[PDB]
Amino acid sequence: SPVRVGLSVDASALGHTIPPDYTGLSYEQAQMANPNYFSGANTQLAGFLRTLGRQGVLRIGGNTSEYTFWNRHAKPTAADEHLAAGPDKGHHAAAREVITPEAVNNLSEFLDKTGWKLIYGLNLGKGTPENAADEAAYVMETIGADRLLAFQLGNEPDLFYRNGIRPASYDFAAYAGDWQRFFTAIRKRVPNAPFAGPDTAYNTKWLVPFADKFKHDVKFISSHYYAEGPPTDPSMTIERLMKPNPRLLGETAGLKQVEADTGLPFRLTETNSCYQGGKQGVSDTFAAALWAGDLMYQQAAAGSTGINFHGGGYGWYTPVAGTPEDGFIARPEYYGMLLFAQAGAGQLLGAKLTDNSAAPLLTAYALRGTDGRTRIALFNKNLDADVEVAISGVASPSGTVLRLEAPRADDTTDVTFGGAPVGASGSWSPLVQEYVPGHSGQFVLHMRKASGALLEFA
């Protein structure tokens, strides 16, 4: 008894072109203490990234970027060789960590193995302008201008007061002074250094004035987004995660207005479902695959240049979990990102849903792929409604579907895409071929409650 909905694809209703480096991941700066983590020797993790995209961006930053210190004079410690730095849980100060030349050297080899570009945090919370200049210089020397997309000067400077990185009086004016002192010092060592900022969630007292003041000094605006609101909200649940987020829609409009005003594009450089490394039973579940995959397309359709899902260690929300010693595994959220990866880049098209008020959390995105083939990504985020989608507007002799599936929305395992789990080192290929029945120039796709689908048309 599915809800019977219509989907009308309009090849003339042109949306944004998804860039090839749209996908991405965010990690804590602290992880750079361990030269074995972002290393050319870390073939497993490099494989996971390549499966997410042949192009993409690795962002390193986070709350630990205020507690992490480049030391050109240092070599990794024995403890550094086993450090697994998951998402910062925001409870108190992170441990002090040291980044060495060796770790930067190894990060360059990791970027060469993955083909991803880098956003690299510098320590404006507690470090000096001169050490940021020295760190930037070594990153530029070692990673190179082609792979280095941007430096960032502080992570979430609007929240520095929370753990005493700044006094409660710290405001945009104080941060602009800091930012300019760091920018000037860095540009003396690295005249071509690229920047992004302010590396926080959209707001009127920080991000808007940042863009106005520093629009000639940055390449793009870096924003953050978590589906979970402030801690006074009802605890985020799977049910809530599947629903529209009016805060997201408003902040995205805010970023679009900044782009119109300043010319600066925006990237979502730290995102995930829930704070503090995630919420067990929400962030580490199949629902996070549906949420993440749908978010990637929602933001692409809104004109975002890309995304970076925060993670690392064994954090509840991490796309990829594990360590070089123990191995790495794809978590449920990774499968949402994998659906996006398999769809590929291209230009979004109009895709209007009708007769869908009883299945209101179904989303759909149509894409003219760079290879000329039409694809449709659907997320049936309705937890209790199966759907039957009558697809009009596509003329093709053959459509196939790859399904994003788990037996329950709160599953922490049992997730597959195209009838297969992801294996070691990001290995994935589809194992189930399913055609979508076509008649009268239309197709009909069934989707179970709490599932996703990627359709490809010949």
Binding site for ligand 8I4 (CB under 6 A): 62-63, 87-88, 90, 155-156, 270, 275-277, 310
Max distance between CA atoms of the chain, in angstroms, equals 71
405 assigned to a ligand binding site? no
Nearest to 339 by CA among 270, 401, 412, 277: 401
Query: Is 277 marked as a binding-site residue?
Result: yes
Taking Cα atoms as reference points, which of 86, 94, 68 lies closest to residue 310? 86
63 is in an annotated binding site: yes
Of 311 and 426, nearer to ligand 8I4 (C-beta) is 311
The reply to whether 102 sits in an annotated binding site is no
State which residue, 39 or 63, has the beta carbon closest to ligand 8I4: 63
Q: Which is nearer to ligand 8I4, 21 or 228 (CB)?
A: 228
Tell me if 270 is assigned to a ligand binding site. Answer: yes
Q: How far is the CB of 200 from ligand 8I4 (least distance, A)?
A: 9
User: Which lies closer to ligand 8I4 via its Cβ, residue 67 or residue 417?
Assistant: 67
Q: How far is the CB of 430 from ligand 8I4 (least distance, A)?
A: 32
22 is in an annotated binding site: no
User: Is 138 one of the annotated binding-site residues?
Assistant: no
Cβ nearer to ligand 8I4, comparing 136 with 268: 268
The response to whether 411 counts as a known ligand-binding position is no
Nearest Cα to 220, choosing from 124, 137, 319, 117?
Answer: 117
What is the rounded distance in angstroms from the CA atom of residue 355 to the CA atom of residue 382? 14
Q: How far is the CB of 63 from ligand 8I4 (least distance, A)?
A: 3
317 is an annotated ligand-binding site residue: yes
Question: Between residues 221 and 454, which has the closer beta carbon with respect to ligand 8I4?
Answer: 221
For residue 257, what are the contacts with CB-CB under 8 A and spacing of at least 6? none
Which residues lie below 8 Å from residue 439, measured CB to CB, with a gap of 6+?
Answer: none
CB of 48 to ligand 8I4, least distance (A): 19
H, E, C per residue of the chain: CCEEEEEEEEEEEEEEEECCCCCEEEEEHHHHHCCCCCCCCCHHHHHHHHHHCCCCEEEEECHHHHCEEECCCCCCCCCHHHCCCCCCCCCCCCCCEEECHHHHHHHHHHHHHHCCEEEEEECCCCCCHHHHHHHHHHHHHHHCCCCEEEEEECCCHHHHHHHCCCCCCCCHHHHHHHHHHHHHHHHHHCCCCCEEEEEEECCCCCHHHHHHHHCCCCCEEEEEEECCCCCCCCCCCHHHHCCCCHHHHHHHHHHHHHHHHHCCCEEEEEEECCCCCCCCCCCCCHHHHHHHHHHHHHHHHCCCCCEEEECCCCCCCCCEEEECCCEEEECHHHHHHHHHHHHCCEEEEEEEEECCCCCCCEEEEEEEECCCCEEEEEEECCCCCCEEEEEECCCCCCEEEEEEECCCCCCCCCCEECCECCCHHHCCCCCCCEECCEECCEEEEEECCCEEEEEEEC
Closest to ligand 8I4 by CB, 108 or 308: 308
Q: Which is nearer to ligand 8I4, 67 or 443 (CB)?
A: 67
| Closest separation in Å from C-beta 398 to ligand 8I4 | 43
Nearer to ligand 8I4, 157 or 426 (CB): 157
Q: Which is nearer to ligand 8I4, 162 or 188 (by Cβ)?
A: 162
> To the nearest whole angstrom, how small is the minimum distance from the Cβ of residue 277 to ligand 8I4?
5
Residue 303: what residue type? Answer: G
Shortest CB 155 distance to ligand 8I4, Å: 5
Shortest distance, CB of residue 299 to ligand 8I4, whole angstroms? 17
In angstroms, give the least distance from the CB of 280 to ligand 8I4: 13
CB of 225 to ligand 8I4, least distance (A): 10
Residue 277 contacts residue 316 (beta carbons within 8 Å)? yes
Residues 255 and 252: their CA atoms lie apart, in Å, by 5
Q: Which residues define the annotated binding site for beta-D-glucuronate?
A: 28, 63, 88, 155-156, 270, 276-277, 317
